[PDB]
Design an enzyme around this catalytic site. Structure first.
Site, PDB file in Angstrom:
ATOM      1  N   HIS A 179     -16.546   0.320 -15.438  1.00 48.10           N
ATOM      2  CA  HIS A 179     -16.160  -1.092 -15.385  1.00 48.10           C
ATOM      3  C   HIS A 179     -16.029  -1.565 -13.940  1.00 48.10           C
ATOM      4  O   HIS A 179     -14.949  -1.492 -13.346  1.00 48.10           O
ATOM      5  CB  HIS A 179     -14.830  -1.321 -16.105  1.00 48.10           C
ATOM      6  CG  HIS A 179     -14.607  -2.745 -16.501  1.00 48.10           C
ATOM      7  ND1 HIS A 179     -15.243  -3.797 -15.877  1.00 48.10           N
ATOM      8  CD2 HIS A 179     -13.801  -3.296 -17.439  1.00 48.10           C
ATOM      9  CE1 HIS A 179     -14.837  -4.936 -16.411  1.00 48.10           C
ATOM     10  NE2 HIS A 179     -13.961  -4.659 -17.361  1.00 48.10           N
ATOM     11  N   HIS A 182     -15.428  -8.094 -13.659  1.00 45.34           N
ATOM     12  CA  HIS A 182     -14.304  -8.925 -14.079  1.00 45.34           C
ATOM     13  C   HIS A 182     -12.959  -8.864 -13.343  1.00 45.34           C
ATOM     14  O   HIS A 182     -11.902  -9.097 -13.943  1.00 45.34           O
ATOM     15  CB  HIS A 182     -14.102  -8.693 -15.579  1.00 45.34           C
ATOM     16  CG  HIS A 182     -15.339  -8.939 -16.390  1.00 45.34           C
ATOM     17  ND1 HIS A 182     -15.459  -8.555 -17.710  1.00 45.34           N
ATOM     18  CD2 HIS A 182     -16.506  -9.550 -16.071  1.00 45.34           C
ATOM     19  CE1 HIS A 182     -16.644  -8.922 -18.168  1.00 45.34           C
ATOM     20  NE2 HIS A 182     -17.298  -9.528 -17.194  1.00 45.34           N
ATOM     21  N   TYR A 184     -11.347  -6.243 -11.971  1.00 41.43           N
ATOM     22  CA  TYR A 184     -10.522  -5.045 -12.083  1.00 41.43           C
ATOM     23  C   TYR A 184     -10.673  -4.214 -10.808  1.00 41.43           C
ATOM     24  O   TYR A 184     -11.343  -4.658  -9.874  1.00 41.43           O
ATOM     25  CB  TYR A 184     -10.862  -4.297 -13.380  1.00 41.43           C
ATOM     26  CG  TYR A 184     -10.444  -5.142 -14.576  1.00 41.43           C
ATOM     27  CD1 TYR A 184      -9.089  -5.403 -14.830  1.00 41.43           C
ATOM     28  CD2 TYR A 184     -11.393  -5.797 -15.364  1.00 41.43           C
ATOM     29  CE1 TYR A 184      -8.695  -6.305 -15.827  1.00 41.43           C
ATOM     30  CE2 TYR A 184     -11.008  -6.702 -16.363  1.00 41.43           C
ATOM     31  CZ  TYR A 184      -9.661  -6.952 -16.585  1.00 41.43           C
ATOM     32  OH  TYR A 184      -9.275  -7.864 -17.554  1.00 41.43           O
ATOM     33  N   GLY A 321     -20.612 -10.130 -27.430  1.00 44.71           N
ATOM     34  CA  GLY A 321     -19.198  -9.823 -27.543  1.00 44.71           C
ATOM     35  C   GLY A 321     -18.535 -10.457 -28.751  1.00 44.71           C
ATOM     36  O   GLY A 321     -18.364  -9.822 -29.790  1.00 44.71           O
TER      37      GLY A 321
HETATM   38  C1  LIG Z   1     -11.382 -10.505 -26.695  1.00 43.92           C
HETATM   39  C2  LIG Z   1     -12.150 -10.164 -25.592  1.00 43.92           C
HETATM   40  C3  LIG Z   1     -12.011  -8.972 -24.937  1.00 43.92           C
HETATM   41  C4  LIG Z   1     -12.849  -8.561 -23.813  1.00 43.92           C
HETATM   42  N1  LIG Z   1     -12.685  -7.316 -23.258  1.00 43.92           N
HETATM   43  C5  LIG Z   1     -13.667  -6.814 -22.514  1.00 43.92           C
HETATM   44  C6  LIG Z   1     -13.595  -5.434 -22.005  1.00 43.92           C
HETATM   45  O1  LIG Z   1     -12.797  -4.596 -22.440  1.00 43.92           O
HETATM   46  N2  LIG Z   1     -14.433  -5.137 -20.969  1.00 43.92           N
HETATM   47  C7  LIG Z   1     -15.437  -6.028 -20.435  1.00 43.92           C
HETATM   48  O2  LIG Z   1     -16.164  -5.604 -19.564  1.00 43.92           O
HETATM   49  N3  LIG Z   1     -15.460  -7.324 -20.880  1.00 43.92           N
HETATM   50  C8  LIG Z   1     -14.727  -7.683 -21.931  1.00 43.92           C
HETATM   51  N4  LIG Z   1     -14.853  -8.948 -22.474  1.00 43.92           N
HETATM   52  C9  LIG Z   1     -16.068  -9.714 -22.119  1.00 43.92           C
HETATM   53  C10 LIG Z   1     -17.188  -9.438 -23.123  1.00 43.92           C
HETATM   54  O3  LIG Z   1     -17.742  -8.125 -22.999  1.00 43.92           O
HETATM   55  C11 LIG Z   1     -18.343 -10.443 -22.921  1.00 43.92           C
HETATM   56  O4  LIG Z   1     -18.966 -10.210 -21.618  1.00 43.92           O
HETATM   57  C12 LIG Z   1     -17.980 -11.908 -23.096  1.00 43.92           C
HETATM   58  O5  LIG Z   1     -17.190 -12.103 -24.302  1.00 43.92           O
HETATM   59  C13 LIG Z   1     -19.141 -12.878 -23.099  1.00 43.92           C
HETATM   60  O6  LIG Z   1     -20.075 -12.536 -24.146  1.00 43.92           O
HETATM   61  P1  LIG Z   1     -20.105 -13.297 -25.537  1.00 43.92           P
HETATM   62  O7  LIG Z   1     -20.405 -14.753 -25.271  1.00 43.92           O
HETATM   63  O8  LIG Z   1     -21.319 -12.643 -26.276  1.00 43.92           O
HETATM   64  O9  LIG Z   1     -18.806 -13.064 -26.253  1.00 43.92           O
HETATM   65  C14 LIG Z   1     -13.933  -9.459 -23.450  1.00 43.92           C
HETATM   66  C15 LIG Z   1     -14.011 -10.729 -24.076  1.00 43.92           C
HETATM   67  C16 LIG Z   1     -13.220 -11.097 -25.165  1.00 43.92           C
HETATM   68  C17 LIG Z   1     -13.472 -12.400 -25.890  1.00 43.92           C
HETATM   69  O1  LIG Z   2      -8.113 -10.374 -21.433  1.00 44.30           O
HETATM   70  N1  LIG Z   2      -8.640  -9.324 -21.765  1.00 44.30           N
HETATM   71  O2  LIG Z   2      -8.041  -8.490 -22.406  1.00 44.30           O
HETATM   72  C1  LIG Z   2      -9.828  -8.861 -21.014  1.00 44.30           C
HETATM   73  C2  LIG Z   2      -9.936  -7.509 -20.702  1.00 44.30           C
HETATM   74  C3  LIG Z   2     -11.032  -7.026 -19.980  1.00 44.30           C
HETATM   75  N2  LIG Z   2     -11.050  -5.576 -19.709  1.00 44.30           N
HETATM   76  O3  LIG Z   2     -11.939  -5.122 -19.045  1.00 44.30           O
HETATM   77  O4  LIG Z   2     -10.342  -4.845 -20.420  1.00 44.30           O
HETATM   78  C4  LIG Z   2     -12.123  -7.873 -19.503  1.00 44.30           C
HETATM   79  O5  LIG Z   2     -13.096  -7.444 -18.858  1.00 44.30           O
HETATM   80  C5  LIG Z   2     -11.929  -9.288 -19.889  1.00 44.30           C
HETATM   81  N3  LIG Z   2     -12.933 -10.273 -19.492  1.00 44.30           N
HETATM   82  O6  LIG Z   2     -13.234 -10.346 -18.324  1.00 44.30           O
HETATM   83  O7  LIG Z   2     -13.483 -10.947 -20.381  1.00 44.30           O
HETATM   84  C6  LIG Z   2     -10.817  -9.771 -20.620  1.00 44.30           C
END
Ligand SMILES: Cc1cc2nc3c(=O)[nH]c(=O)nc-3n(C[C@H](O)[C@H](O)[C@H](O)COP(=O)(O)O)c2cc1C
Ligand SMILES: O=[N+]([O-])c1cc([N+](=O)[O-])c(O)c([N+](=O)[O-])c1
Length: 362
Positions: A179, A182, A184, A321
């Site tokens: 990762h 975003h 982190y 996602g």
């Molecule tokens: C509930 C939620 C949790 C997310 N957690 C992660 C995560 O653990 N790691 C990550 O890299 N991005 C995370 N994202 C971002 C998604 O992987 C994705 O890039 C984003 O939702 C945009 O794609 P989508 O329009 O197909 O949902 C999260 C988004 C949402 C809505």
């Molecule tokens: O709020 N969220 O729990 C969340 C968590 C992560 N992460 O990596 O665990 C993301 O990458 C994003 N994100 O950037 O969509 C959101």
């Protein structure tokens, strides 16, 4: 149509190009940050995906930033994940674990000893994270100002990633996704907005990318380059972390460096949930000619967009996602052009089965 055609991704072969994006759901057991049987069922329901990329998972206790997020550093966690990957494989699926360190996006109440979280610099993320109240319900709370990692603490971070990958291998994961996006820890070092270090880990793009590249080398050596994937969000702003004044050039530098390691894939998170400027085809071409592995596009994609870019030979697969949260059998739905289940955002984080395993398949 090419979304439903095979693709070689590092050590494995996906039967289609419809991938499940990593999604934090905050339903792990505490104490212990342990994956649950419910989580196992959730992933099993989505095993038809070309590739499942798990929710972000802690490489260590210090890496924890949200109450409910799972880890992959303790015996209990490894045993729990082994059951989850086994379920996915029982359904002939493939699953990668996304490994992370939250850095400054955390709170002292969930850190070891209740102390301040760490980062490249002592700058508050100025955002919120999620904790749990006395009833176990998810609650948003402002992030705690971090402590800047001391130079001699960096090797320990790299080693935690190395060990987590070794753990991932034993836990049965097919691949690992670092990762580096975003906002982190890894992205905190990459971005000049969150990195004001004066040592070799701050300043130039070479210095800013130093940590992530040391991690990549460490994990390739621990396991194999064809088992390693990485997620980056190099263009735009994500959770208050931008990519500096020369984002495109810095992005291409990083990609060329990653390419030298011959890793399995490059996962490009194109936009923050709040939106961002779209990638130009010219930029996609420059990325394309610099990486020789699989390229996954992500961020509010439509099936049409995925087909268009895959057809132009610009990307190989797409990660969905939110559509995967609401549609376990998204592959079949996209293939049949069937309607999707409506999303219920209130249950994205925390809670139980409701809004998690209760979205029906066709
Ligand atoms: C509930 C939620 C949790 C997310 N957690 C992660 C995560 O653990 N790691 C990550 O890299 N991005 C995370 N994202 C971002 C998604 O992987 C994705 O890039 C984003 O939702 C945009 O794609 P989508 O329009 O197909 O949902 C999260 C988004 C949402 C809505
Ligand atoms: O709020 N969220 O729990 C969340 C968590 C992560 N992460 O990596 O665990 C993301 O990458 C994003 N994100 O950037 O969509 C959101």
């Amino acid at each position: 149509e090419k979304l439903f055609t095979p693709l070689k991704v590092g050590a494995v072969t996906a039967p289609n190009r419809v991938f499940m994006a990593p999604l934090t759901r905050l339903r792990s057991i505490e104490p212990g940050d342990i994956p649950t049987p419910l989580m196992g069922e959730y992933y099993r329901q989505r095993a038809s995906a070309g590739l499942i990329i798990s929710e972000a998972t802690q490489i260590s206790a210090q890496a924890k930033g949200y109450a409910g997020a799972p880890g992959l550093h303790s015996p209990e966690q490894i045993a729990a994940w082994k059951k989850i990957t086994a379920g996915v494989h029982a359904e002939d699926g493939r699953i990668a674990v996304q490994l992370w360190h939250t850095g400054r996006i955390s709170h002292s109440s969930i850190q070891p000893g209740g102390q301040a979280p760490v980062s490249a610099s002592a700058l508050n993320a100025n955002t919120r994270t999620s904790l749990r109240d006395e009833n176990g319900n998810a609650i948003r709370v402002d992030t705690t100002t971090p402590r800047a990692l001391e130079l001699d603490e960096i090797p320990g971070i790299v080693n935690d990633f190395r060990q987590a990958v070794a753990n991932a291998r034993e836990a049965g994961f097919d691949l690992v996704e670092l990762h580096s996006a975003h906002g982190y820890l890894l992205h905190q070092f990459l971005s000049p907005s969150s990195n004001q270090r004066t040592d070799q880990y701050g300043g130039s793009v070479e210095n800013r990318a130093r940590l992530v590249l040391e991690v990549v080398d460490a994990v390739c050596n621990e396991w194999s380059a064809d088992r390693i994937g990485i997620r980056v969000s190099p263009i735009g702003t994500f959770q208050n972390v931008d990519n500096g004044p020369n984002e495109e050039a810095d992005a291409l530098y990083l990609i060329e460096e990653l390419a030298k390691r011959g890793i399995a894939y490059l996962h490009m998170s194109e936009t923050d949930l709040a939106g961002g400027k779209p990638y130009s085809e010219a930029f996609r071409q420059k990325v394309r000619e610099r990486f020789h592995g699989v390229i996954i596009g992500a961020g509010a994609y439509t099936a049409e967009k995925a087909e268009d870019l895959i057809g132009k030979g610009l990307i190989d697969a797409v990660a969905f996602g939110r559509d995967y949260i609401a549609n376990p059998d998204l592959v079949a739905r996209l293939q049949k052009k069937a309607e999707l289940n409506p999303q219920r955002p209130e249950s994205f984080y925390g809670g139980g089965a409701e809004g998690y395993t209760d979205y029906p398949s066709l």
